[PDB]
Amino acid sequence: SHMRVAVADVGTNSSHLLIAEALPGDAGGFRVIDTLKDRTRLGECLDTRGELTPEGEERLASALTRFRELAASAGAGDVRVYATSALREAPNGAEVAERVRQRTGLYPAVISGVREGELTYLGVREAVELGPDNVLLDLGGGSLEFVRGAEERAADVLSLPLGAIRMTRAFPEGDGKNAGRDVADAVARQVRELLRPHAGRFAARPGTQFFLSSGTAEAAADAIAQRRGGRPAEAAGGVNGERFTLTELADLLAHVARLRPAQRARVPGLERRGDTILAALSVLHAALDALGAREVTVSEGALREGMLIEELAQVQTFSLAQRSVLATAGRFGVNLSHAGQVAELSRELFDRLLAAGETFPPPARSLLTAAAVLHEAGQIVRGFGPQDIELIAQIARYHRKSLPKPSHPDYVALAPADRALVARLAGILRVADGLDRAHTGLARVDDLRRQGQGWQLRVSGVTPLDLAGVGEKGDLWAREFGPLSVQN
Numbered sequence: 001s002h003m004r005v006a007v008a009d010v011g012t013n014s015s016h017l018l019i020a021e022a023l024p025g026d027a028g029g030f031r032v033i034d035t036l037k038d039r040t041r042l043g044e045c046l047d048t049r050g051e052l053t054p055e056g057e058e059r060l061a062s063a064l065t066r067f068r069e070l071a072a073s074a075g076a077g078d079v080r081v082y083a084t085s086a087l088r089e090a091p092n093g094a095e096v097a098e099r100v101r102q103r104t105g106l107y108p109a110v111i112s113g114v115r116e117g118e119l120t121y122l123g124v125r126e127a128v129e130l131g132p133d134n135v136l137l138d139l140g141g142g143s144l145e146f147v148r149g150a151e152e153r154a155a156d157v158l159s160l161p162l163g164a165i166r167m168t169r170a171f172p173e174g175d176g177k178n179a180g181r182d183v184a185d186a187v188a189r190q191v192r193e194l195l196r197p198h199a200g201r202f203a204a205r206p207g208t209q210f211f212l213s214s215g216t217a218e219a220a221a222d223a224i225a226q227r228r229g230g231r232p233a234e235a236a237g238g239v240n241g242e243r244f245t246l247t248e249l250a251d252l253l254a255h256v257a258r259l260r261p262a263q264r265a266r267v268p269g270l271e272r273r274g275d276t277i278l279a280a281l282s283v284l285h286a287a288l289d290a291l292g293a294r295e296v297t298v299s300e301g302a303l304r305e306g307m308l309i310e311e312l313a314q315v316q317t318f319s320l321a322q323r324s325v326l327a328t329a330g331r332f333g334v335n336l337s338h339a340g341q342v343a344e345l346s347r348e349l350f351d352r353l354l355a356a357g358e359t360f361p362p363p364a365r366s367l368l369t370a371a372a373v374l375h376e377a378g379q380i381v382r383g384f385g386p387q388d389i390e391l392i393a394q395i396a397r398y399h400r401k402s403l404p405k406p407s408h409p410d411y412v413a414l415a416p417a418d419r420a421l422v423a424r425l426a427g428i429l430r431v432a433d434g435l436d437r438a439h440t441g442l443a444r445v446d447d448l449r450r451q452g453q454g455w456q457l458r459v460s461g462v463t464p465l466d467l468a469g470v471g472e473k474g475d476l477w478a479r480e481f482g483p484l485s486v487q488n
């Protein structure tokens with residue numbers, strides 16, 4: 001009943017963790033239990049080639065070790081990890097992520113900037129009052145997402161390389177009096193060059209509400225509130241829902257550009273961003289000005305909140321879409337997200353095989369779903385008859401070197417057609433667990449076609465770990481249905 005969930009995002013400035021407990025009623029809601037930030041500073045750990053250094057890998061692994069520990073102390077156990085610009089753009093990111101999974105057990109799965117904007121927008125929705133027409137800016141250390149949408153989800157997402165660290169490094173500050181103003185001006189021109197062909201999609205219309213998320217914008221809201229004679233936001237309840245104007249942002253930026261980098265970390269509210277804050281504030285001002293914004297609201301919800309919403313959405317709606325089967329897997333303490341995603345992928349692969357001509361018996365789909373949800377219940381290695389559950393049991397636990405050997409007592413041998421059914425469904429299920437090996441819930445089958453005497457599988461939303469898992473978990477598919485080639 002007390003089922004707790006953990007999600008994390010690995011970005012360019014820092015890494016973030018949210019541990020929460022879901023709300024009853026298959027509603028899609030959660031109660032926050034714990035949050036954690038880690039100054040992983042991956043964007044400062046890139047080499048001249050853009051590769052993440054062994055020191056960045058260590059900081060990564062360290063953060064995911066902290067995350068895995070806190071998540072288990074709270075009772076979550078498994079953590080879904082998404083990664084944004086630093087690891088996404090690093091030529092060695094796939095390697096880094098596989099290495100870091102070996103060390104910690106957590107795989108940092110790179111998502112597209114569009115999907116980063118999409119999920120961030122759901123996090124903002126969980127924190128503030130979106131209206132019929134919203135434009136969100138999310139400035140990280142590496143990129144800046146522009147998102148527009150209405151009251152429930154994103155409509156258009158653009159992702160630009162205008163991040164706080166990236167812009168600080170791309171316009172190094174000089175030694176003169178106007179050095180800060182000159183960095184601000186040049187950063188502001190870079191924003192204009194890259195946004196200009198897309199500005200209209202995010203431009204102010206009558207009634208448009210503008211929102212900012214993430215730590216630069218939160219620091220700026222705090223600095224502006226303190227410049228209006230306010231108290232530090234940490235002494236208060238945070239900055240969620242605070243509003244400031246474009247003029248106030250402009251005023252703070254002018255002050256910052258006049259200061260020297262070390263002086264900026266003594267500006268109240270900016271003490272933890274002195275090195276990137278000048279460039280960061282230029283990005284924010286220039287972009288908002290390009291879009292015609294005059295006021296913004298700041299949100300403390302971001303990627304990790306939308307990660308929990310998207311997860312709870314699919315997981316709870318799948319149980320509505322066997323509903324006890326996901327619940328019974330809960331009694332065995334399994335990762336319901338993984339189990340539900342593996343069941344959906346099994347469903348997807350099964351239907352294409354049927355449509356291509358493969359004959360299956362009527363209960364086969366129901367059997368594969370049930371074994372899909374109980375594949376990782378250590379204890380196990382409802383409208384199902386006693387013979388069906390035995391079939392389900394053997395599908396969940398299929399291996400060539402079975403723990404009981406045929407000659408050994410207690411060995412359970414089915415009838416030949418059931419043996420053959422188990423093998424064919426276990427090959428489907430294994431491909432499915434491969435497609436969610438990264439535990440992202442993001443894989444989807446797009447097309448599965450016969451290719452000669454074998455098959456060709458097209459998958460989307462798949463990480464390099466997921467694709468590797470199918471290759472390592474698809475040998476049974478090849479014996480049962482024919483050689484399998486996966487693409488995209």
Ligand SMILES: [K+]
Nearest residue numbers: 138139140143
């Ligand atoms: K971001």
Ligand SMILES: [K+]
Nearest residue numbers: 188189192193
């Ligand atoms: K310009």
